[PDB]
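Lab notebook, bench 4. We co-purified these components, and the gel suggests they stay together. Before we commit to crystallization screens, I want a quick structural picture of the whole thing.
Request: model the full complex, all chains together.
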Amino acid sequence: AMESIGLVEVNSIARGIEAADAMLKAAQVDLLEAKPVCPGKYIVLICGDVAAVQSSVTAGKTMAAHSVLDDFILPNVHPQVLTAISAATPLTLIKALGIIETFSIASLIVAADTAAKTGQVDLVEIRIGMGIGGKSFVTLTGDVASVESSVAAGVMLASERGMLVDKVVIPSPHDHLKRC
Amino acid sequence: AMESIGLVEVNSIARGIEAADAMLKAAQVDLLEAKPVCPGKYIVLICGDVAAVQSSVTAGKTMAAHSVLDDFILPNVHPQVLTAISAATPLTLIKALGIIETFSIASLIVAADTAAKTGQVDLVEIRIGMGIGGKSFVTLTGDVASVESSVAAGVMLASERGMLVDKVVIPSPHDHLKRC
Amino acid sequence: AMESIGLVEVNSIARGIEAADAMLKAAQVDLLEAKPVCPGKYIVLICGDVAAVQSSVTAGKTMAAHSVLDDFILPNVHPQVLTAISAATPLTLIKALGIIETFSIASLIVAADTAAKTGQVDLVEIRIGMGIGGKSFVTLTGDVASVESSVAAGVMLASERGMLVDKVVIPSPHDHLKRC
Amino acid sequence: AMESIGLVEVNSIARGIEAADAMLKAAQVDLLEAKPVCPGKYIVLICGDVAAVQSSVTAGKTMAAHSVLDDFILPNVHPQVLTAISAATPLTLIKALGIIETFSIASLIVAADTAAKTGQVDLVEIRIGMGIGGKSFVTLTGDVASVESSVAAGVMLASERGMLVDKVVIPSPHDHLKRC
Amino acid sequence: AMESIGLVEVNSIARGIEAADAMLKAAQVDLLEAKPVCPGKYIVLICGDVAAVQSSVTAGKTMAAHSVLDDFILPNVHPQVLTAISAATPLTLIKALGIIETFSIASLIVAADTAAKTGQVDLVEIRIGMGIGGKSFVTLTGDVASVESSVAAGVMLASERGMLVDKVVIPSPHDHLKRC
Amino acid sequence: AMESIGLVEVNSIARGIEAADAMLKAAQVDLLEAKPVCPGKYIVLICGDVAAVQSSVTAGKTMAAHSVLDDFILPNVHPQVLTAISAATPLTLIKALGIIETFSIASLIVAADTAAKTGQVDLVEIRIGMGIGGKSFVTLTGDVASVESSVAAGVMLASERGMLVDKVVIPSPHDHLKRC
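Here is the predicted assembly.
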């Protein structure tokens, strides 16, 4: 089995911190992200096995109750999505550069995961948050054809749901773009 | 005599900086905080004796005039409120964890001060600001009963005025919550 | 010839990054600033010769298309505006302190440039952005008369266009204002 | 009773971390500082009551054994020494500026404490460490006569023991020195 | 096949940067670390397949020539050693805490790798460098018996070669040690 | 006239801070750098007109007396040396990459200045200090021939005086070297 990712979005820092406590305790899950985002959201991201993430997410929904804004689970998430989120992808020689930008963290996770699952790309970074808009984004590289079809796929779902801000493929990025 | 705390909130950075200059000059007061908060507020927090804080606050209200959004004074403020604000509370062994979160800096000061004044807690941190919402919060620890009755008291006033976002008491915080 | 400054404001990070790539490639220009500002804008600032900046700005407008929020060019910009923007003005003994604060980056550039062009002041800093409001500001020093007439001039244009938040001249700034 | 301060210096990070664990557990003491300093020292600073600090220091000496380089205790330490060490002295209007610089952390604590105990000064900062030399220093302000006699006293002990690097009193510090 | 790790230590920043350039170019390897350490060393750490790391290391030794201080290769390195080095191990619930500290980066890599290979521990962090001494260290957690036998094994080789500074197992770390 | 650069190196932080105060006061000079470097040096770098820098340097030598380790003045310094030192060179497209590394800050200034004065290069950065060794370095770019003859010239003087650690010209730097 591959791991799952779970997300709870909460209206309060206070409640978000209590929800995070519940989520960590509920089952064997690792914390990826617990932080205040755009006003005045608090988000919790965790990863573990399918069933472990499901208990953890229910636990947080239980504690947070009416201040839950969103909860989401993506089973069989691509390993690179997790490392990217945890600001931990190794230095990658960037070739062609793709960027997907969505209105919600859930749609971003879906897009990043779909992107990574198609062909030969490496995710470069994921930005949940980040002060503010609520806009999140993923960047990736590979040869131009690989990147092109990876962002087109990464975008299919998000666009249908009106969650997609925009995307770009930049084939030969200027060096002040590799000066990330 | 115990010290007082004074707050001026201003619509401009420019005016806020001029107001802060007036406030520092007006009387023997110390500056706790002078910073831009949520759009596009500038806040000034100062502390000194009752009468000194009163002159300082009037001075700022004088300079800032129509771009004042709020001015506030809390006499006989608990020493821990001040150290907490000035990001200066020593490392405290966190036992049970209480958090109060309010819509305004004034209501937060009142809540933190009332919390500290009731029983045996230590305030852990205060966050004015902080990008954004305008939401502020206080965290504190102690044994569970002490914390429970300290946040209930800290909350009484704020809730009546519709300034209270929320609160939590977490009796046995997970270690990734002591990883503050 | 003195250099020009060009600005493109874009609705997406993704598009903003693609626009920046186009702008750098279009002609011999230097990048001053490329960054996400208030929700969910991305801004690009560049400098070079008149004609070089014009090509660069058209290039970005070309790539960014309907997600352009603003594009602007200021020819014969004062050298101090550029160094101030690039967070690079040397330590300056601050005498009298002037601050201009505007609702748009364009109006700020105009105001800073007009300020620097009048009499004997040194710009101290420029803040584009900066989380959030969209409010930008310039600070400058000199003797009191020089600063007074430099901000009055720096403000003329901005005020007529309803782009001016406010300004202050502080003749003898308190030392916790020289503690910038 | 006023509080005491205790210091253990250890040859290893590993041992220093174990010593710190012992020290925190030994008695009701607060941790001020636990950090690697010049090669390859680890230092622990704690504060509490006389007897509590004595148990804590013995505990660390017990765990650290032959990798102890120095242990020290200063009873009835001036409250300002503690706040200064914990990087927590409020913004202070600096008038005349005194600086004492010693070869050892112990001699610095003694000097800072003696300085604070004489007349009307406020300690501004203490730097243990700090990469490297092993040199530590204290800065303080007040009127010129107060500062002059406070550093002369702060220096008496240190100089006799050949632990004193040097000191200065700067009566009217340039503003780029108040730009601390 | 599992990956290998290669290290080149160079006497100059200048030469170290040239060596790093050679190493990256020589074969498909990823850069883990390229940085100045204690005076005036520059270190390069890379990872890839056995043969790729061997070419990369020879390349750096070629460019750096007489300013090479050390070169080292560890085949079949434990995946956790790499993630730990690249400051990228996820938040781990620390139980019992082990620390190994050595005089050389090579001996540290060997010790960390041997530690991770024995029983059920998770490496928490690795510190190459770090200003200064040249001392490096690894921390790990698990239950007490697992950690005890993992550091004893991690230490065997290093101690025989006089490269071992020291080690500790702390069974129940104080919470200000989980405040890492 | 072009500006000069002056350097005073002092044995104490305390004395170095007093020397810096004297230097700033002595004449119309700007402060470039005032900071503790390798154990336990404090360095002051200033720039202004020839005669102004000469007064400033004599002033510091006067205050610092026997704790002066070095004083130096370089007349008609290249504008790029100053901007490079003040961490303020704009983003430069790096082509071929040259690096000069010397044992003393004086020899570095001389080398950087000679480098910039020969042909068409742009200095990229200067690192005085920097923890530790006392080793300083300059990086520059241009086409390969320009860089080659600029570092050869930049090195002539330093090598004769045994102050030169080393240099490199890297014609096609790997992208993780443009990831500066």
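Chains B and F do not touch (no CB pair under 8 Å). Worth comparing against the SEC data before the next meeting. Helices of chain B lie at 13-25, 50-64, 79-85, 105-117, 144-160, 175-178.
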